[PDB]
Amino acid sequence: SQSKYVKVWEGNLSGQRQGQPVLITRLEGYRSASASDSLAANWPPTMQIVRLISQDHMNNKQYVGKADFLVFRAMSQHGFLGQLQDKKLCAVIQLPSQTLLLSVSDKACRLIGMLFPGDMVVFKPQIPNQ
Protein backbone atom coordinates (compact mmCIF):
# COMPACT_ATOMS: atom_id res chain seq x y z
CA SER A 1 0.00 0.00 0.00
CA GLN A 2 0.93 3.69 0.02
CA SER A 3 0.91 5.49 3.37
CA LYS A 4 2.94 6.49 6.43
CA TYR A 5 0.85 5.08 9.27
CA VAL A 6 -2.08 2.73 9.87
CA LYS A 7 -4.17 2.67 13.05
CA VAL A 8 -6.22 -0.46 13.73
CA TRP A 9 -8.57 -1.55 16.52
CA GLU A 10 -9.30 -5.00 17.96
CA GLY A 11 -10.07 -6.96 21.11
CA ASN A 12 -8.57 -10.04 22.74
CA LEU A 13 -6.64 -11.45 25.70
CA SER A 14 -3.40 -13.27 24.89
CA GLY A 15 0.21 -12.16 25.24
CA GLN A 16 2.67 -13.44 27.83
CA ARG A 17 6.00 -15.23 28.24
CA GLN A 18 6.40 -18.95 27.56
CA GLY A 19 3.32 -18.86 25.35
CA GLN A 20 0.95 -17.61 28.04
CA PRO A 21 -2.15 -15.41 27.61
CA VAL A 22 -2.55 -11.78 28.70
CA LEU A 23 -5.07 -9.53 30.44
CA ILE A 24 -6.58 -7.67 27.48
CA THR A 25 -10.05 -6.83 26.18
CA ARG A 26 -10.35 -4.12 23.53
CA LEU A 27 -7.66 -1.63 22.50
CA GLU A 28 -6.21 0.16 19.47
CA GLY A 29 -2.76 0.45 17.91
CA TYR A 30 -0.86 2.49 15.33
CA ARG A 31 1.70 0.77 13.10
CA SER A 32 3.99 2.42 10.55
CA ALA A 33 2.73 1.96 6.99
CA SER A 34 6.10 0.25 6.57
CA ALA A 35 4.17 -2.88 7.53
CA SER A 36 1.63 -4.98 5.63
CA ASP A 37 -2.11 -4.35 5.92
CA SER A 38 -2.83 -8.05 6.44
CA LEU A 39 -0.72 -7.68 9.58
CA ALA A 40 -3.36 -5.75 11.52
CA ALA A 41 -6.12 -7.41 9.50
CA ASN A 42 -5.37 -10.87 10.90
CA TRP A 43 -2.97 -9.80 13.65
CA PRO A 44 -2.50 -12.59 16.23
CA PRO A 45 -4.30 -11.72 19.49
CA THR A 46 -1.80 -14.00 21.25
CA MET A 47 1.79 -12.86 21.77
CA GLN A 48 4.72 -14.91 23.08
CA ILE A 49 7.69 -13.07 24.58
CA VAL A 50 10.87 -15.06 25.18
CA ARG A 51 13.43 -12.26 25.07
CA LEU A 52 13.98 -8.72 26.35
CA ILE A 53 14.52 -5.59 24.26
CA SER A 54 15.74 -2.27 25.64
CA GLN A 55 14.70 1.20 24.45
CA ASP A 56 18.24 1.55 23.11
CA HIS A 57 17.46 -1.16 20.55
CA MET A 58 14.64 0.82 18.94
CA ASN A 59 16.73 3.99 19.16
CA ASN A 60 18.29 2.99 15.84
CA LYS A 61 16.52 4.76 12.98
CA GLN A 62 18.85 3.03 10.52
CA TYR A 63 16.78 -0.13 10.99
CA VAL A 64 13.32 1.45 10.90
CA GLY A 65 13.70 2.06 7.18
CA LYS A 66 13.92 -1.61 6.24
CA ALA A 67 11.48 -2.79 8.91
CA ASP A 68 7.94 -1.85 9.94
CA PHE A 69 6.68 -0.09 13.07
CA LEU A 70 3.97 -1.07 15.54
CA VAL A 71 2.47 0.91 18.42
CA PHE A 72 -0.02 -0.28 21.04
CA ARG A 73 -2.63 2.21 22.23
CA ALA A 74 -4.20 1.31 25.58
CA MET A 75 -6.07 3.17 28.32
CA SER A 76 -4.74 1.12 31.23
CA GLN A 77 -1.73 -1.01 32.15
CA HIS A 78 0.24 -2.62 34.98
CA GLY A 79 3.97 -2.48 35.70
CA PHE A 80 4.48 0.05 32.92
CA LEU A 81 5.76 2.54 35.49
CA GLY A 82 8.23 -0.02 36.81
CA GLN A 83 10.23 -0.33 33.61
CA LEU A 84 9.56 3.20 32.36
CA GLN A 85 11.07 4.25 35.69
CA ASP A 86 13.86 1.67 35.63
CA LYS A 87 15.14 1.43 32.06
CA LYS A 88 11.96 1.90 30.04
CA LEU A 89 11.66 -1.24 27.91
CA CYS A 90 9.81 -4.53 27.43
CA ALA A 91 10.16 -8.12 26.21
CA VAL A 92 10.74 -9.30 22.65
CA ILE A 93 8.33 -11.57 20.77
CA GLN A 94 10.00 -14.42 18.87
CA LEU A 95 7.72 -15.78 16.15
CA PRO A 96 8.47 -18.81 13.94
CA SER A 97 7.38 -16.71 10.96
CA GLN A 98 8.55 -13.24 11.97
CA THR A 99 10.26 -11.27 14.73
CA LEU A 100 8.46 -8.64 16.81
CA LEU A 101 10.05 -6.49 19.52
CA LEU A 102 8.18 -4.95 22.45
CA SER A 103 9.63 -2.07 24.46
CA VAL A 104 7.73 0.30 26.75
CA SER A 105 9.34 3.69 27.34
CA ASP A 106 8.04 7.21 27.99
CA LYS A 107 4.59 5.71 27.45
CA ALA A 108 2.31 4.59 30.28
CA CYS A 109 -0.83 4.26 28.15
CA ARG A 110 1.12 3.18 25.07
CA LEU A 111 3.76 0.64 24.02
CA ILE A 112 6.54 0.67 21.43
CA GLY A 113 6.86 -2.25 19.03
CA MET A 114 8.94 -3.18 16.00
CA LEU A 115 8.06 -5.47 13.09
CA PHE A 116 10.97 -7.47 11.68
CA PRO A 117 11.05 -10.14 8.94
CA GLY A 118 11.50 -13.82 9.75
CA ASP A 119 15.02 -13.90 8.32
CA MET A 120 13.60 -13.92 4.79
CA VAL A 121 13.99 -10.30 3.70
CA VAL A 122 14.65 -9.65 0.01
CA PHE A 123 17.11 -6.86 0.82
CA LYS A 124 19.25 -5.99 -2.20
CA PRO A 125 17.86 -3.07 -4.25
CA GLN A 126 17.65 0.58 -3.19
CA ILE A 127 14.94 2.49 -1.34
CA PRO A 128 13.38 1.27 1.94
CA ASN A 129 11.63 -2.01 1.11
CA GLN A 130 7.99 -1.37 2.00
Contact 50, 92 (CB under 8 A): yes
Q: Residue-wise over 11-29: b if at least 16 C-beta within 10 A, else e? A: ebeebeeeeeeeebeebeb
Q: Strand, coil or helix: what is 80?
A: helix
Nearby residues of 41 by Cβ (< 8 Å), 6 or more positions away:
8
User: Around Cβ 65, how many Cβ atoms within 10 Å?
Assistant: 11
Contact 101, 111 (CB under 8 A): no
For the chain, domain boundaries? 5-117
Q: How was this entry determined?
A: NMR
